[PDB]
Amino acid sequence: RPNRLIVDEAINEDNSVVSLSQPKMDELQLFRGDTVLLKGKKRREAVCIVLSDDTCSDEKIRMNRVVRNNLRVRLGDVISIQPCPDVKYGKRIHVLPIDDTVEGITGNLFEVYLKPYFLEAYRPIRKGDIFLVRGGMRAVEFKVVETDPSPYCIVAPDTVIHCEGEPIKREDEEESLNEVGYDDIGGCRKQLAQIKEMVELPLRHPALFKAIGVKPPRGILLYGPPGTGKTLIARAVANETGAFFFLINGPEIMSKLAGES
Amino acid sequence: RPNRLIVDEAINEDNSVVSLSQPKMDELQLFRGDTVLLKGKKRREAVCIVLSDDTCSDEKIRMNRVVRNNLRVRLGDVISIQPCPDVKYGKRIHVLPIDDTVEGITGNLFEVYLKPYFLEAYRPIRKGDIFLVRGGMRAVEFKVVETDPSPYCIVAPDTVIHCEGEPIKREDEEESLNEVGYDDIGGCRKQLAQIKEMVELPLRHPALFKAIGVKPPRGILLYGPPGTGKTLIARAVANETGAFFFLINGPEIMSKLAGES
Amino acid sequence: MSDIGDWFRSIPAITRYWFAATVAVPLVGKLGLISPAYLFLWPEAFLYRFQIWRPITATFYFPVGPGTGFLYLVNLYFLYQYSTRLETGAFDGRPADYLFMLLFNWICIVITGLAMDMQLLMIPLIMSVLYVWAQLNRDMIVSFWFGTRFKACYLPWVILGFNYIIGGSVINELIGNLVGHLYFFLMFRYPMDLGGRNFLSTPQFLYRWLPSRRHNWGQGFRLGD
Amino acid sequence: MSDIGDWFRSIPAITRYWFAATVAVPLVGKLGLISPAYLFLWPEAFLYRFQIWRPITATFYFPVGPGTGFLYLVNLYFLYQYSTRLETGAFDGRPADYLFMLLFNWICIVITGLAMDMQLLMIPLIMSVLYVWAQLNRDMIVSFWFGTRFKACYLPWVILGFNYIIGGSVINELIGNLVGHLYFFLMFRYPMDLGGRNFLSTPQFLYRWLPSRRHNWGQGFRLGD
Numbered sequence: 001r002p003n004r005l006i007v008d009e010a011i012n013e014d015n016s017v018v019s020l021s022q023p024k025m026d027e028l029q030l031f032r033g034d035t036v037l038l039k040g041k042k043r044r045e046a047v048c049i050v051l052s053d054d055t056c057s058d059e060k061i062r063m064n065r066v067v068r069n070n071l072r073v074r075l076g077d078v079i080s081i082q083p084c085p086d087v088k089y090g091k092r093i094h095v096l097p098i099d100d101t102v103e104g105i106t107g108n109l110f111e112v113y114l115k116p117y118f119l120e121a122y123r124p125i126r127k128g129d130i131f132l133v134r135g136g137m138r139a140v141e142f143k144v145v146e147t148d149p150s151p152y153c154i155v156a157p158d159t160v161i162h163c164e165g166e167p168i169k170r171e172d173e174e175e176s177l178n179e180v181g182y183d184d185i186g187g188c189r190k191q192l193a194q195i196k197e198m199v200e201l202p203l204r205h206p207a208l209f210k211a212i213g214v215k216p217p218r219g220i221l222l223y224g225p226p227g228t229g230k231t232l233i234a235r236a237v238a239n240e241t242g243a244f245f246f247l248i249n250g251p252e253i254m255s256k257l258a259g260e261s
Numbered sequence: 262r263p264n265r266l267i268v269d270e271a272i273n274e275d276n277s278v279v280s281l282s283q284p285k286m287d288e289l290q291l292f293r294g295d296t297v298l299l300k301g302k303k304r305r306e307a308v309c310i311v312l313s314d315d316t317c318s319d320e321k322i323r324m325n326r327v328v329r330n331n332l333r334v335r336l337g338d339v340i341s342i343q344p345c346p347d348v349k350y351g352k353r354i355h356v357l358p359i360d361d362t363v364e365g366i367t368g369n370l371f372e373v374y375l376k377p378y379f380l381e382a383y384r385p386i387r388k389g390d391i392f393l394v395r396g397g398m399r400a401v402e403f404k405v406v407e408t409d410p411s412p413y414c415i416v417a418p419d420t421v422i423h424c425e426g427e428p429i430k431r432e433d434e435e436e437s438l439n440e441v442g443y444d445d446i447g448g449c450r451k452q453l454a455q456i457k458e459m460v461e462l463p464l465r466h467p468a469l470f471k472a473i474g475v476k477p478p479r480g481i482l483l484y485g486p487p488g489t490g491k492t493l494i495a496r497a498v499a500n501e502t503g504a505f506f507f508l509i510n511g512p513e514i515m516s517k518l519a520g521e522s
Numbered sequence: 523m524s525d526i527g528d529w530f531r532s533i534p535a536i537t538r539y540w541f542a543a544t545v546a547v548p549l550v551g552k553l554g555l556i557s558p559a560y561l562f563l564w565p566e567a568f569l570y571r572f573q574i575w576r577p578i579t580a581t582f583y584f585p586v587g588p589g590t591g592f593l594y595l596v597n598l599y600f601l602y603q604y605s606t607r608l609e610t611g612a613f614d615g616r617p618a619d620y621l622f623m624l625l626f627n628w629i630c631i632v633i634t635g636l637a638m639d640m641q642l643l644m645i646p647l648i649m650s651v652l653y654v655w656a657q658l659n660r661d662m663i664v665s666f667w668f669g670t671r672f673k674a675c676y677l678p679w680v681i682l683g684f685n686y687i688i689g690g691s692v693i694n695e696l697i698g699n700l701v702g703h704l705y706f707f708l709m710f711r712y713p714m715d716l717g718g719r720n721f722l723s724t725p726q727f728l729y730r731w732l733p734s735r736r737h738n739w740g741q742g743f744r745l746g747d
Numbered sequence: 748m749s750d751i752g753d754w755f756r757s758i759p760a761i762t763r764y765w766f767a768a769t770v771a772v773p774l775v776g777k778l779g780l781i782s783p784a785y786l787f788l789w790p791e792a793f794l795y796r797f798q799i800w801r802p803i804t805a806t807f808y809f810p811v812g813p814g815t816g817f818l819y820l821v822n823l824y825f826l827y828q829y830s831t832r833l834e835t836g837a838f839d840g841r842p843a844d845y846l847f848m849l850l851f852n853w854i855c856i857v858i859t860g861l862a863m864d865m866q867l868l869m870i871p872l873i874m875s876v877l878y879v880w881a882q883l884n885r886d887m888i889v890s891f892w893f894g895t896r897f898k899a900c901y902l903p904w905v906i907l908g909f910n911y912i913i914g915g916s917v918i919n920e921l922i923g924n925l926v927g928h929l930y931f932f933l934m935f936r937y938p939m940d941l942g943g944r945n946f947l948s949t950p951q952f953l954y955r956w957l958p959s960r961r962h963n964w965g966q967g968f969r970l971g972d
């Protein structure tokens with residue numbers, strides 16, 4: 001698997017660049033100015049542009065702090081890189097400022113920061129990303145909440161942007177689908193062990209399990225006293241193995257409207 | 262014409278053996294270990310090895326599912342048998358694996374399956390046959406597309422077997438060997454015998470039953486604990502006798518919508 | 523209940539001023555109030571004489587007689603039933619755009635009809651509108667009557683064949699499909715897979731003539747180079 | 748996803764090209780790029796002057812109008828749906844024999860059309876190929892969407908009745924059946940009746956252009972013991 005790659009510090013400070021060694025780009029058949037998808041932990045995705053670098057080792061990827069925050073990784077970790085040549089030119093985006101960066105600015109952000117940054121830049125961005133802009137005296141932090149088309153886009157001169165709105169906070173609700181894992185579970189050692197034993201294989205490697213020809217489990221009933229936190233168990237398992245946990249509540253399904261439930 | 266016989270289930274699980282009663286062998290001058298030719302419906306022909314069995318009656322011929330499928334006949338039908346000691350040792354045989362069994366194997370097929378099955382077996386083969394080989398966790402099925410000499414030949418130690426090529430698609434005649442038959446039911450001999458008794462005539466020879474003028478049974482209630490294999494029994498009966506099995510589910514019919522159920 | 527008034531009011535603005543027009547012009551021709559000979563878009567007289575009234579009026583008329591009314595009826599039905607869909611989605615928040623594209627289509631079709639010797643005009647424009655809708659709503663599923671499961675981006679070709687086999691006159695649908703495809707390149711596909719600069723910008727005087735909606739994300743600006 | 752492209756590509760090359768030409772030529776003829784009067788195979792014009800322009804095109808051309816749409820549709824349907832069926836059987840690995848047969852039938856039909864007065868030599872070739880397919884697939888229970896128990900080797904006469912009641916020009920389809928019968932007698936029944944050398948021998952030029960596809964043994968391993 002020539003996709004796992006260790007990380008390293010960056011030389012250039014551009015947000016949307018990664019430094020690659022020449023043999024690696026030869027092996028993966030990537031050319032300069034193209035777009036690739038970077039996937040890591042916590043189901044975090046990013047888009048970047050491949051750049052050349054002789055100094056960097058073949059197994060090492062040179063990459064800066066903002067991408068590391070976006071991917072929720074650290075130094076010495078592993079990141080997967082995949083090609084993405086179907087990147088789609090965007091039409092309209094909505095960008096908002098973070099709460100603790102616009103204290104005492106009281107100005108138009110379109111021309112001071114956004115226009116100098118996005119001119120002839122061709123910077124691809126994805127929904128939910130956090131990026132920094134250096135200007136006069138403050139490092140303004142911005143969040144992308146929507147893009148057309150979603151989630152992949154490229155900033156172009158003939159695009160319309162909207163940055164008018166209240167300064168949004170940092171996370172608010174982005175912790176339920178986040179770091180919560182095995183470290184936030186107590187008093188369930190045996191049951192968690194059994195669940196991990198009977199669920200790890202059919203979710204991590206589905207193709208091999210299909211190839212073998214053995215029926216996977218189709219239903220599990222976690223029964224016990226209320227308030228023990230079973231939904232947190234399921235959320236932790238889904239967020240750890242890697243899935244699309246989709247919660248369905250009882251009462252809201254019941255009383256929607258007569259026969260439309 | 263003392264050659265017409267009626268087929269019946271077999272006890273030996275080998276794919277190239279047929280069980281006979283000794284009086285028929287004496288009458289037909291057939292010795293143990295001889296190779297005989299079988300002709301059936303749709304001008305399909307096969308080759309088999311004759312083995313003596315006391316249990317089977319004179320008028321009945323025992324054969325497993327693969328030979329019956331090759332002859333395109335069902336249980337209780339009539340076939341033709343002749344001797345043919347003029348079989349010559351083969352030179353080379355080209356075999357291919359049917360596509361809808363080999364999904365995700367990625368390996369050398371000749372050593373794993375064909376060599377153990379064909380070793381010291383002297384199995385006679387004919388062009389266009391289908392034979393099933395048990396393996397690791399699957400049951401592969403192979404088709405012979407070319408032989409030399411044609412059509413009768415014997416697999417010998419001095420033989421060059423070619424098994425490389427694009428997998429063959431389905432013949433579109435069905436006869437999928439992955440379905441359920443009388444060999445996939447155990448521990449229900451008496452009830453299966455009763456059902457096979459009183460379902461046979463109304464589904465095999467409707468014209469004779471109508472001519473006689475006798476009321477056939479119209480309903481059967483299979484009752485027992487859940488998970489004891491009733492749907493499997495019904496499917497096996499339908500696939501063996503030959504019918505248009507149509508399954509109606511309780512919950513599907515019940516809650517479709519209000520009145521149009 | 524005056525269903526006529528309520529139904530007319532429920533019709534969106536632009537189509538309300540188009541539909542009625544194309545069902546009012548033929549009457550004048552059929553009742554003989556105005557001579558139909560002045561309503562056939564003669565190209566040579568248009569080139570030589572002024573004949574300014576020819577293009578605006580010749581695109582709204584179709585003689586109806588013994589058995590030619592069925593095509594008119596089905597064309598009008600498709601026009602209404604798909605122009606409502608075209609206004610309610612896609613071109614929804616841009617009333618000027620739904621009008622600018624119509625004028626662009628009309629200019630192109632009158633140019634190519636002056637080049638050719640075609641008489642009538644509405645059918646190719648209807649085909650262009652239908653095609654520009656169909657190319658935008660791919661991967662759907664619809665059926666006319668006979669339980670057929672044609673997916674999308676085929677219906678213009680299907681009705682092309684329907685008109686072709688049952689009768690004739692095939693040029694005046696190809697000439698509309700080509701114009702629709704050209705508009706689709708010049709509006710959506712070209713400055714979206716290569717990055718070329720926009721060549722179709724709606725003038726601001728249309729916006730001052732007809733106001734736009736209030737966008738969900740406040741108001742936006744164009745970057746440029 | 749291009750369903751039409753994949754469907755076209757799954758078609759065999761011989762019949763894909765035949766179908767493509769048979770569909771393309773009438774559209775060009777009706778479109779007005781060339782006058783239809785230039786492709787009719789006039790016997791006297793070909794007899795007196797050379798006129799190599801119109802011995803071949805009349806086979807691939809058909810002046811479709813609002814009288815014969817159904818006939819054209821059913822003819823192309825049968826052509827498409829039986830050419831592939833003939834390809835699967837018989838000439839399954841010998842396309843050169845298929846080209847030999849089609850060229851023989853076309854030459855015979857053009858000669859007999861030179862003798863007779865028929866102008867559109869498209870139906871007889873389809874009738875001949877359908878007749879030969881029916882005669883080479885005898886005793887087979889054929890049934891279309893509503894056919895109950897229709898027997899083989901009778902479909903040519905059923906389509907004879909269908910074409911005679913719908914339209915006319917019965918001479919062309921009779922002569923097509925005649926040439927089909929002649930080829931069938933001289934190709935397969937001749938060696939088993941007289942035992943002489945096959946007068947219908949394909950020259951090596953087609954083998955050079957279209958070599959027959961033989962078996963591919965590949966590489967194998969000796970079983971041993």
Ligand SMILES: Nc1ncnc2c1ncn2[C@@H]1O[C@H](COP(=O)(O)OP(=O)(O)O)[C@@H](O)[C@H]1O
Pocket residue numbers: 445446447448486487488489490491492493494
């Ligand atoms: N001889 C047998 N007797 C009973 N069950 C069997 C037998 N062979 C296989 N089975 C199992 O029975 C299952 C089918 O049971 P099913 O007929 O659905 O039960 P129920 O009739 O209660 O719905 C299959 O998954 C199969 O693994």
